[PDB]
């Protein structure tokens, strides 16, 4: 029931909702998408197989040989990921594919084979995602974020009324195919439906109508309703449907069957239509003006002379009807036109259309498509037939057809990848309906319209782009003759594939450097949802419509966690339970609500299907059956929330924390914060620095273990068993006898990563948490990585805080930090920097790194060896020498000015062929010794495991306690044992030990070769040396530290212990925050966390009291049981009677520093539970205590809040930020000082700061800040001399960057000069 890592320290879980679906693997998007990329696909629709079947088989141009594809297989990486990070080479795998080349013999007719060759050709190096989600491209670990772009399909958008200023909205429709030419219909303010293709010239839409072989008659039949007139004995009798008169005004006496139904001047009432239906009317006598404006449907030819009376789509009139009736025409068909319901948007376009048939329509489409090129028949018909109806030059994807048929109210979400006739007709009908108001436009930022294009899809796209170039090269090379001598690999070059996959993985707008100063920062950078990138919107041209959180974001995208600043909401982050659909849309889990019972079946609803049903709220109280306790529950119907009946609901939310991300699910009491402060809390919790010793949060949200385990920072056991040898650098696990495999049993080894350097220059180092001789299970955390404590996220330290103003040292947002905080060595963080020195190949000979340099004392060469490289472990300070280098005529790598630290790792690279120096050689000798020690220690530990299993199976069938030790372990086969299956098992294990012996003799030489192999470097250099400094940046006034609820602030004083406000017991407060930051920034969650942390440390202090004095295990057991009780019907329910009286003494050993508390995000601990838990300890249940002053020794009246707030130290130090400059380098084209801190640069006194001096009277100060201090070199040298000579006086002169301007205008045809 409890894993052994979770029996060490059981986090007391508050919260009352029983969870029905565990959190998924938090990196499911990256891992599952890329395993959708590289996997053998028998169905052949995903990844590399789909690309190969899409391109191959390829025909030669002469049509005599095709090159076809059989199967593919990923090879093995020549380097491991640690070595890839060390050497600076891509972690890639070879792509070995079996192409098959046929040859057709010229004698026999088309289709015959002479010879058919088939070999495995090497093409490309595709990088492999590591077992976390991160690629290694050049040793810089890059993460590829998913993209949120428009799904190909049909979009009915509109202007809101923002063109041509008449207030008319212009409803437009647009077909966006996945691959092909776009189409879009739009309106003109003259109510004309026009067509255009790929934003070319704008044609009448009836041209595209005719081009599909539609006559005018078919157009009017499809796009309009008919009205039947009949000339008879009196008047033009006309057949009428009752509903046709809705919303018109009566213009005559509407009379039928001798009954005057409607009088003129009346709006046709609902009663009119009802009485017309009741009286069973069909026919109306209409006057002659009721045809005088209406328009005929069909062209009417003479029944005798065969001549056309009225053209198609022509308005009837008086004499027109007379000539129609004198030709014996009895039936008249008319367009059911309106002004509000069925407008004449097609007829007017037919009138403005200058084209009368299909062929001239195709010619018009040609002349719009291609200027020039006088069209023919076959050219135009071919262009139109392959413009939208070719499977190869136009293709909606399967997602494209899905969106197309879904948005057009169809049912078949499968179909052809091309357009058709009825598709375009349905689009046109939908656009006309939207103009009529029936049907509505589609908002673009709806998550049913936006699609997740993850790493698998983008890499497959770039690989297909790489393949199509190889396709052309193979095509032309096969077109080249003499094909019998050649082979696959000769025509097909690997370079296009590798180049076009490397320009994606290396330098793309979405393959970005990994934020790697946390476990949380990694695991929430691998789930970002960028709206930018190729095929997406631009960063600085995104309106407020995109940046708002749409009501579809619930459950799919976190609404709070997003960066603030220039891109708010463009870089959204995924929610906890959200997944990607089979088409790419974001779907979220829900519980299916049956007749009245909330069941436990989980339906993943997408963003479109959600709008039809109604979904309950995450916390709507049901009691033990799935029946809601309330008969009016809060629900979400369609992009909007309401109050619904207890039987009307369809779905419940899965868990109370499905709205938020993983970065904002670790904020306790999130339901009490604001959303601005929750945004700031998530965005700064993403920045915390892993401190020296990790310290658990006393108030978590129970999500800490998921974040620690799911990210790859911890070292977690693959198979359970018993630990056999724990070092600070490795962990050996002897497997249990049941999970272990039959052949090559062995025991598992976890080589922990020691003090290596993260991407953000922080220290990541796994350290073991399991002691020797200790059982572990499958999924048990063995080693805690950077900022983890016993396998749960511990980003910062939990600190005793008091909320009061203290002499203004915490004035605005500042923090007053006790000196006990820096004494206890808790916020001091390691920072590892990497300095590289290069040995260029240059004129007058390359550079030698040997120690001999001129104009140096021996103190500058005290630490460097004979070879010119500083020893490992030598404390350097700013200005020292790490690697001495010479100018061929002091080009040494010096420590930058200001940084201390210890040199902890020196690595040397060298091109193959260049001889190495003595310290270089000893580095490879230690590397050979280390690799041989690793392989040989692996070999002998595996020998011990194999022989331990050999002795374990020897218990039955040939047991020999003393005979087995008469000969050594090697000859453990030919002893006394009956020739049965057990001897076969002994043969298996011993012959596989022999296999391990062979593995030694090859693997050792392979590693020896790898160590002595020269490494590829960029041309120009010879040898590269990298020195790794380790600094311990502790804390000082200035280091910006924050909390979890968005309460940032630099610290303003390191106050000594006795000055700190101490309580009635004598314990000094460690941090004095400010109360004034709580009301105006409504983050009440920090006060609630302060109280809960006070309660937790009270419980931990009581356990520490019962442990410091020795008390029997019954007392501790009873108190811990009381503590794990007292929730208001919580779901934790841990029972201590199953604990074996030893693990209680370890549980209460881990609980002596405060009893950790879980507060799930929106189902947290109420106030009553906090008061009760404070009451269990001997603390005052009001949260606040009386707190004595430190200096005056008297009492702070108005008793103040103390507690245990969990504070982080962010990565905005003050050693990084402080900078100053008197005189240094100067820029070249313009003699202004350089800019930056890396460059020794001066601050920019910009435009606004110049206005800030013009607004004063400071003319002289301004004059020197833009002539003397900066720009006039003849002025600044003399100013330096004057300052040194004690005389403060400027001779200003003329700024040089105005002479630069003068020359750059004078170098045009403009004479600009200075007068007298």
């Amino acid at each position: 029931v409890y894993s052994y890592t979770e029996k060490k320290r059981i986090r007391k879980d508050f919260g009352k909702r029983p969870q029905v679906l565990d959190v998924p693997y938090l990196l499911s998007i990256q891992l599952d998408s890329f395993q959708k990329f590289i996997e053998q696909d028998p169905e052949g629709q995903y990844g590399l197989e789909a690309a190969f079947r899409s391109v191959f088989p390829i025909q030669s141009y002469s049509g005599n040989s095709e090159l076809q594809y059989v199967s593919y297989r990923l090879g093995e990486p020549v380097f491991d990921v640690q070595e890839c990070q060390i050497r600076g080479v891509t972690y890639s795998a070879p792509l070995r594919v079996k192409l098959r080349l046929v040859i057709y013999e010229r004698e026999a007719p088309e289709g015959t084979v002479k010879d058919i060759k088939e070999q495995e050709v090497y093409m490309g190096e595709i990088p492999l995602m590591t077992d976390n989600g991160t690629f290694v491209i050049n040793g810089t670990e890059r993460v590829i974020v998913s993209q949120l772009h428009r799904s190909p399909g049909v979009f009915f958008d509109s202007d809101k009324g923002k063109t041509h200023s008449s207030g008319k909205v212009l409803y437009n429709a647009r077909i966006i195919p996945y691959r092909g030419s776009w189409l879009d219909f739009e309106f003109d303010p003259k109510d004309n439906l026009f067509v255009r293709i790929d934003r070319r010239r704008k044609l009448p839409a009836t041209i595209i109508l005719r081009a599909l072989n539609y006559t005018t008659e078919q157009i009017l039949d499809l796009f309009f309703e008919k009205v039947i007139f009949e000339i008879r004995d009196n008047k033009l009798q006309m057949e009428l449907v009752p509903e046709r008169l809705r919303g018109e005004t009566a213009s005559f006496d509407i009379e039928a069957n001798g009954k005057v139904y409607v009088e003129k001047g009346r709006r046709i009432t609902a009663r009119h239509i009802r009485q017309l239906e009741k009286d069973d009317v069909k026919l109306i006598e209409v006057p002659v003006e009721y045809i005088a404006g209406k328009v005929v449907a069909k062209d009417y030819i003479d029944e005798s002379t065969g001549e056309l009376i009225c053209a198609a789509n022509m308005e009837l009139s008086l004499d027109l009807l007379a000539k129609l009736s004198q030709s014996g025409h009895k039936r008249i068909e008319t367009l059911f036109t309106n002004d509000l319901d069925h407008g004449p948007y097609i007829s007017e376009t037919l009138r403005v259309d200058p084209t009368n048939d299909r062929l001239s329509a195709l010619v018009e489409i040609y002349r719009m498509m291609r200027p020039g090129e006088p069209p023919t028949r076959e050219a135009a018909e071919s262009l139109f037939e392959n413009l939208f109806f070719s499977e190869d030059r136009y293709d909606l994807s399967a997602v494209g057809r899905m969106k197309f048929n879904r948005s057009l109210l169809r049912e078949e979400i499968e179909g052809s990848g091309i357009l058709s006739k009825d598709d375009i007709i349905d689009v046109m009908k939908k656009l006309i309906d939207i103009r009529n108001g029936k049907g509505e436009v589609d908002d673009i930022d709806h998550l049913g319209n936006r699609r997740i294009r993850s790493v698998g899809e983008m890499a497959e796209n770039q690989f297909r782009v790489g393949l199509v170039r190889v396709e052309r090269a193979v095509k032309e090379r096969l077109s080249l003759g003499d094909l019998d001598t050649l082979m696959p690999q000769d025509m097909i070059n690997a370079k296009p594939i590798s180049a076009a996959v490397k320009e994606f993985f290396g330098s793309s707008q979405l393959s970005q450097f990994m934020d790697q100063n946390n476990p949380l920062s990694e695991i929430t950078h691998k789930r970002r949802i960028s709206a930018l990138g190729p095929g997406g919107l631009t960063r600085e041209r995104a309106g407020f419509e995109v940046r708002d959180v749409h009501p579809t974001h619930y459950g799919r995208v976190c609404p709070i966690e997003t960066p603030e600043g220039p891109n708010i909401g463009l870089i959204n982050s995924l929610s906890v339970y959200a997944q990607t659909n089979e088409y790419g849309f974001l779907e979220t889990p829900y519980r299916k609500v049956t007749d009245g019972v909330v069941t436990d079946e989980i339906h993943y609803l997408s963003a479109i299907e959600e709008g039809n049903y109604v979904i309950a709220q995450a916390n709507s109280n049901l009691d033990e059956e799935g029946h809601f306790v309330e008969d009016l529950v809060t629900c979400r119907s369609k992009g909007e929330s309401s109050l619904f009946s207890r039987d009307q609901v369809d779905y419940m939310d899965v868990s109370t924390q499905q709205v938020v991300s993983v970065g904002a699910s670790l904020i306790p009491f999130l339901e009490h914060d604001d959303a601005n402060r929750a945004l700031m809390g998530a965005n700064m919790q993403r920045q915390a620095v892993p401190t020296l010793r990790a310290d658990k949060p006393l108030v978590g949200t129970g999500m800490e273990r998921a974040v620690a385990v799911d990210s790859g920072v911890t070292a977690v056991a693959k198979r359970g068993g018993v630990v056999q040898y724990v070092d600070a650098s490795r962990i050996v696990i002897k497997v249990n006898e049941d999970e272990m495999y039959p052949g090559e049993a062995g025991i598992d080894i976890y080589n922990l990563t020691k003090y290596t350097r993260s991407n953000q220059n922080t220290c990541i180092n796994q350290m073991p948490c399991v002691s020797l001789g200790e059982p572990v299970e499958r999924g048990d955390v063995l080693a805690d990585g950077p900022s983890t404590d016993l396998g749960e996220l511990a980003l910062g330290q939990n600190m005793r805080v008091a909320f009061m103003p203290w002499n203004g040292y915490n004035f605005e947002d500042s923090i007053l930090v006790s000196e006990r905080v820096v004494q206890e060595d808790r916020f001091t963080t390691i920072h590892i920097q990497e300095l590289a020195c290069v040995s260029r190949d240059t004129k007058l000979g390359p550079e030698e790194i040997t120690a001999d340099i001129p104009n140096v004392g021996e103190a500058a060469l005290s630490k460097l060896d004979e070879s010119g490289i500083v020893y490992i472990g030598a404390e350097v300070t700013g200005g020292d020498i790490l690697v001495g280098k010479v100018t061929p005529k002091d080009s040494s790598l010096r420590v930058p000015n200001g940084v201390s630290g210890t040199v902890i790792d020196v690595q040397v690279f060298t091109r193959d062929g260049v001889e190495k120096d003595k310290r270089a050689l000893e580095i490879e000798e230690m590397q050979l010794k280390q690799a041989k020690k690793d392989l040989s220690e692996e070999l002998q530990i595996l020998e011990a495991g194999l022989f331990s299993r050999i002795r374990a199976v020897l218990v039955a069938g040939g047991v020999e306690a003393e005979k087995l030790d008469k000969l050594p372990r090697d000859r453990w086969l030919e002893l006394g044992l009956t020739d049965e299956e057990k001897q076969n098992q002994l043969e298996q294990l011993a012959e596989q030990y022999d296999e391990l012996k062979h593995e030694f003799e090859k693997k050792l030489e392979a590693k020896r070769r790898k160590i002595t192999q020269g490494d590829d470097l960029a041309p120009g250099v010879l040898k590269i040396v990298k020195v790794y400094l380790a600094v311990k940046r502790r804390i000082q006034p200035g280091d910006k530290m924050a909390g979890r609820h968005g309460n940032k602030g630099v610290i303003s004083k390191i106050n000594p212990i006795e000055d700190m406000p101490y309580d009635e017991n004598g314990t000094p407060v460690d941090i004095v925050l400010n109360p004034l930051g709580v009301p105006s920034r409504m983050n009440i969650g920090q006060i609630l966390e302060t109280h809960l942390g006070m309660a937790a440390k009270g419980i931990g202090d009581k356990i520490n009291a019962m442990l410091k004095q020795q008390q029997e295990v019954a007392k501790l057991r009873e108190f811990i049981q009381r503590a794990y009780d007292l929730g208001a019907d919580v779901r934790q329910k841990v029972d201590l009677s199953t604990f074996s009286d030893e693990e209680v003494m370890r549980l209460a050993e881990n609980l002596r520093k405060g009893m950790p508390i879980a507060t799930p995000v929106f189902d947290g601990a109420k106030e009553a539970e906090i008061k009760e838990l404070l009451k269990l300890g001997d603390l005052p249940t009001s949260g606040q205590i009386r707190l004595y002053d430190g200096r005056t020794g008297e009492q702070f009246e108005r008793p103040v809040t103390v507690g245990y707030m969990y504070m982080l130290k962010l990565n905005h130090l003050v050693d990084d930020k402080m900078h100053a400059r008197s005189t240094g380098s100067y820029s070249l084209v313009t003699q202004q000082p350089l800019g930056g801190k890396a460059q020794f640069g001066g601050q920019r006194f910009g435009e606004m700061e110049v206005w800030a001096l013009e607004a004063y009277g400071a003319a002289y100060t301004l004059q020197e800040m833009l002539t003397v201090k900066s720009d006039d070199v003849n002025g600044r040298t003399k100013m330096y001399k004057n300052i040194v000579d004690g005389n403060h006086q400027m001779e200003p002169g003329m700024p040089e960057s105005f002479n630069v301007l003068l020359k750059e205008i004078r170098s045009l045809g403009i004479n600009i000069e200075l007068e007298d």
């Binding site: 002469s62 005599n64 010229r106 052309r472 077109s479 003759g481």
Partner: protein
Amino acid sequence: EAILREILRGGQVYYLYNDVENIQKAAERLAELVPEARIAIGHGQMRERELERVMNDFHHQRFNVLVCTTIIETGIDIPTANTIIIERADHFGLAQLHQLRGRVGRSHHQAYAWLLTPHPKAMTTDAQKRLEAIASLEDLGAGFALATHDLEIRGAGELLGEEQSGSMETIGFSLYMELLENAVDALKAGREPSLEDLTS
């Protein structure tokens, strides 16, 4: 339509396939496309007697269309041949394209010179530049302009060496004149015989 334009006029067609292995196929492919033609092949790897056999058949109009490689670059020009069709104008020297474009005519019959190219994405960028270079400057006296545009496309090769038409960064014109006058002085000075002359 180009082939029937030249045939029903009464003149031969220079079909330029520029390949030896596939030209045999292209013969019957063109024959199937154009039944109204009398097609035969001639290329440089024929036995050099059948080649002149085909040429002396071609002077006497016994067959219209001659699918042929660039042996006609030398040209044996007849009066009736008046339409050259390049099958792959993608890869050809610009000088070669102009020269073959000059192989037709020599009569009062208005000639044509089609330059069939592959898909505009398929051809290389230098192939593109050659194609607008030949398409644009089309008039009388375009021989010099085409070579002038060929320069700065390929770049003048190294001045003092072999290997015309290369974009190399070798010695400039200023240094070359200096070397030449220095050589003139050192030669005219002391009695120094010529290099190649002492090769005698």
